[PDB]
């Protein structure tokens, strides 16, 4: 064939820390369908938000929002525990259907997104250029976030994993260091603050 319908930009959702996780890659031929399981960031999360995005940037915020919806009723469980199946399906007329289903509870929500939504030709052309120009920074952003999300989880298990020795003072002190590093944007400072936390958590 010399011509074909593709979806012109990557489509995905926003994941923990403000990142775009892609479900359908740009220039994928339509119709097409892909699913991916996600879970919860923290303990006892009963409600998740599915925020649909079109674009190539690693920062969710830099992509074109296509819509969103909530999925509630999830049994409050430990992080990583819920299995939220996310499905993106683009039919031959270009209509996008997005659904999220929590496997344990059976709770499902969905949204339908008109084919005309999203960025236009010139917009699409900018998006690709701006993504390739910023490839280096988006990648360092994506690492930052992976490092932050680890730091974050470490803060939450270290607080739960607290009679411990009368020395745990320096831990509560190393927690404040880490909580502060996680707010900045220097991947290495965050890991260093984690390293300091491991080294005073030996008695734990």
């Amino acid at each position: 064939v010399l011509l074909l319908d593709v979806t012109p930009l990557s489509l995905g959702i926003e994941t923990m820390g403000g990142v775009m996780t892609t479900l359908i890659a740009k220039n994928t031929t339509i119709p097409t369908k892909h699913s991916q399981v996600f879970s919860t960031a923290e303990d006892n999360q009963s409600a998740v938000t599915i925020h649909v995005l079109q674009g190539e940037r690693k920062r969710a915020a830099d992509n074109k929002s296509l819509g969103q919806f909530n999925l509630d009723g999830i049994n409050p469980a430990p992080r990583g525990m819920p299995q939220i199946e996310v499905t993106f399906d683009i039919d031959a007329d270009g209509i996008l259907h997005v659904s999220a289903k929590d496997k344990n509870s059976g709770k499902e929500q969905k949204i339908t997104i008109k084919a005309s939504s999203g960025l236009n030709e010139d917009e699409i052309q900018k998006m690709v250029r701006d993504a390739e120009a910023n490839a280096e920074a988006d990648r360092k952003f994506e690492e930052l976030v992976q490092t932050r999300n680890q730091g974050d989880h470490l803060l939450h298990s270290t607080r739960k994993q607290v009679l411990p020795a009368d020395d745990k003072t320096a831990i509560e002190s190393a927690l404040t260091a880490l909580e502060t590093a996680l707010k900045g944007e220097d991947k290495a400072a965050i890991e260093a603050k984690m390293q300091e936390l491991a080294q005073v958590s030996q008695k734990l």
Binding site: I13, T15, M16, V37, F38, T40, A41, V48, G80, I84
Partner: peptide, 8 residues
């Protein structure tokens, strides 16, 4: 391994 949705 599964990525995480935003949290509250």
């Amino acid at each position: 391994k599964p990525p995480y949705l935003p949290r509250p």
